[PDB]
Amino acid sequence: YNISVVGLSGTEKEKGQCGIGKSCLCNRFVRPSADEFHLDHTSVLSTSDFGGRVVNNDHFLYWGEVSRSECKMHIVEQTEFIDDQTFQPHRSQPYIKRAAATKLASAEKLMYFCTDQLGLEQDFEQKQMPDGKLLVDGFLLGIDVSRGMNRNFDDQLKFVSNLYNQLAKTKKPIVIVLTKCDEGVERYIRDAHTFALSKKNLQVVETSARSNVNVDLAFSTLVQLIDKSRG
Numbered sequence: 763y764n765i766s767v768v769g770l771s772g773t774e775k776e777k778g779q780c781g782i783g784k785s786c787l788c789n790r791f792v793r794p795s796a797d798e799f800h801l802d803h804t805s806v807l808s809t810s811d812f813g814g815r816v817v818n819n820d821h822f823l824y825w826g827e828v829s830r831s832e833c834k835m836h837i838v839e840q841t842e843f844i845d846d847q848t849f850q851p852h853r854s855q856p857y858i859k860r861a862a863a864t865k866l867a868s869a870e871k872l873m874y875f876c877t878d879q880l881g882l883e884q885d886f887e888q889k890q891m892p893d894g895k896l897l898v899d900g901f902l903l904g905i906d907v908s909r910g911m912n913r914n915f916d917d918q919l920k921f922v923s924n925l926y927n928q929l930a931k932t933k934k935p936i937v938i939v940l941t942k943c944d945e946g947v948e949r950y951i952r953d954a955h956t957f958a959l960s961k962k963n964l965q966v967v968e969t970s971a972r973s974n975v976n977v978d979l980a981f982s983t984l985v986q987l988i989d990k991s992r993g
């Protein structure tokens with residue numbers, strides 16, 4: 763099962779200086795131990811970092827393989843990395859099209875652990891993404907329902923709707939995932955539920971990576987929809 767985690771991404775200004783929680787969700791699913799869960803996963807990278815084997819000149823990360831409870835899940839996060847001097851996106855398609863990619867070729871791409879790893883990967887375990895290539899089986903569509911540093915929520919939901927349209931054209935299974943529900947805003951959660959109820963069989967899993975609630979449920983729910991359609 764190849765799972766792509768997608769959501770609002772871009773420049774600091776487009777994220778209101780607060781990402782929506784993709785990285786912490788992936789980190790908690792793949793490595794839920796306190797020692798391996800990191801709350802801080804910056805997307806502002808030096809050219810050396812971006813060209814390292816973890817990022818591999820891509821705007822996505824390979825978070826690794828999960829083999830828990832027998833189903834194998836391969837996890838990736840689609841994001842956007844900005845330059846640590848110019849603060850513009852690294853020149854690697856627009857995010858909404860990039861994130862909806864279902865064929866992800868990055869030869870010799872290494873699994874991501876933390877930003878400390880970047881440009882220093884000999885210092886960490888070096889596990890390669892399988893075959894240098896992943897055919898995406900399904901998408902988790904993250905929606906931050908936290909007030910999260912005075913975010914323009916309606917612009918988030920507009921972005922989510924356009925991203926959803928691109929994903930839906932693929933006919934791949936999508937599960938909507940509400941993030942940071944430990945700080946959830948009822949108006950935002952309700953708006954997200956109304957949006958998802960406007961779509962066909964769009965499931966919503968309410969998660970908090972920080973408090974570790976319903977993360978596994980989110981991924982297993984997607985895996986179940988994946989085999990719904992595979993059958």
Ligand SMILES: Nc1nc2c(ncn2[C@@H]2O[C@H](COP(=O)(O)OP(=O)(O)OP(=O)(O)O)[C@@H](O)[C@H]2O)c(=O)[nH]1
Nearest residue numbers: 771781782783784785786803805841942970971972
């Ligand atoms: N309260 C709470 N805060 C969270 C949670 N998850 C993430 N955050 C905060 O939100 C910020 C965003 O974290 P990320 O997971 O990197 O967000 P992102 O979607 O990956 O952002 P980009 O990768 O830059 O697109 C983090 O610095 C955390 O402090 C959560 O589950 N609960």
Ligand SMILES: [Mg+2]
Nearest residue numbers: 784785803841
């Ligand atoms: Mg991220």
